[PDB]
């Protein structure tokens, strides 16, 4: 059969939320995508042999509420917490995103994956160890990606799907 999964991609402006989502749904890198566009995108993939329908909200303008986020923050099953490896402030923001999602969900167990994007760049400011340790403090996976080269993109989304599957078994 199949399973549908509602995913929400969050993180600072410019970390590559749109580039990651577009690499997942269209299999190419789009280097210029309006930073104000917040929308949901549907994509059918196969994960571990099962047909999987992904309904992904690519968030934007997160300093204000939106009706799309009011709907997906409540119904969303899993979240990708994205930072850029060359942006310290985007990594420093991560704990704020997790804390707020936990309050929205009223739960200490919300499926999440930490994503360190832009792994192709030469001037990283966030060491992989700091991100691995932060993910370990939350009990969640950490995946290094590059939306530019497609490195780790399917792994980030599929790992989040695996985290949701485990949560649903409870």
């Amino acid at each position: 059969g199949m399973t549908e999964y509602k995913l929400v991609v969050v993180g600072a402006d410019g970390v590559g939320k749109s580039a990651l989502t577009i690499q997942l749904i269209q299999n190419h890198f789009v280097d210029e995508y309006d930073p104000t566009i917040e929308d949901s995108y549907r994509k059918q993939v196969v994960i571990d042999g099962e047909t999987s329908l992904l309904d992904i909200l690519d968030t934007a303008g997160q300093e204000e509420y939106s009706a799309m986020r009011d709907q997906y923050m409540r119904t969303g099953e899993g979240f990708l917490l994205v930072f850029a490896i060359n942006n310290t402030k985007s990594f420093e923001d991560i704990h704020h995103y997790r804390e707020q999602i936990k309050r929205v969900k009223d739960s200490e167990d919300v499926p999440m994956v930490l994503v360190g994007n832009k792994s192709d760049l030469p001037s990283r400011t966030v060491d992989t160890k700091q991100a691995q340790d932060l993910a370990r403090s939350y009990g969640i996976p950490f995946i290094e990606t590059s939306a530019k080269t497609r490195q780790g993109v399917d792994d980030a989304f599929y790992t989040l799907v695996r985290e949701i599957r485990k949560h649903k078994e409870k």
Partner: peptide, 14 residues
């Protein structure tokens, strides 16, 4: 600020 959903708000710009 960060306002992902009502009625939460976090000041993350400081």
């Amino acid at each position: 600020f960060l306002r992902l959903a009502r009625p939460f708000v976090s000041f993350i710009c400081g």
